[PDB]
């Protein structure tokens, strides 16, 4: 129902590994950490699911940047 501070930093590392350098990993994490609990746990456990939400977040962050 919102990620703990411990859970949030697990998502941060997880996001960093499937992103390059210079990617907005703090903002991508904020977006994923907002998701329901079953989807957060899925993003720490399935590296391919994580890559799908990291990418579709980083795209919404592009659409919003203009």
Numbering used by the authors: 95 to 160
Published text:
Rrm4 is the key RNA-binding protein of the transport process that recognises defined sets of cargo mRNAs via its three N-terminal RRMs. Rrm4 and bound cargo mRNAs are linked to endosomes by Upa1, containing a FYVE zinc finger for interaction with PI3P lipids (phosphatidylinositol 3-phosphate). Here, we demonstrate that a flexible MademoiseLLE (MLLE) domain platform within RNA-binding protein Rrm4 of Ustilago maydis is crucial for endosomal attachment.
A complete dataset was collected from a single crystal diffracting to 2.6 Å resolution and a P43212 symmetry. Surprisingly, the unit cell dimensions were small and, with a Matthews coefficient assuming 50% solvent content, only 128 amino acids would fit into the asymmetric unit of the crystal. The structural data indicated that the protein was truncated from both termini during crystallisation, resulting in a shortened version of the H-Rrm4-NT4 protein that formed stable crystals. Both MLLE2Rrm4 copies adopted the same overall fold as seen by the RMSD of 0.29 Å over 59 C-alpha atoms. The MLLE2Rrm4 domain consisted of four helices (designated α2–5) arranged as a right-handed superhelix similar to MLLEUBR5. When comparing the obtained crystal structure with the MLLE2 Rrm4 model generated by TopModel, the average RMSD was 0.69 Å over the backbone atoms, close to the uncertainty of the atomic coordinates of the experimental structure. The accessory MLLE2 domain shows variations in the critical region of the predicted PAM2 binding pocket, suggesting a novel mode of interaction with currently unknown interaction partners.
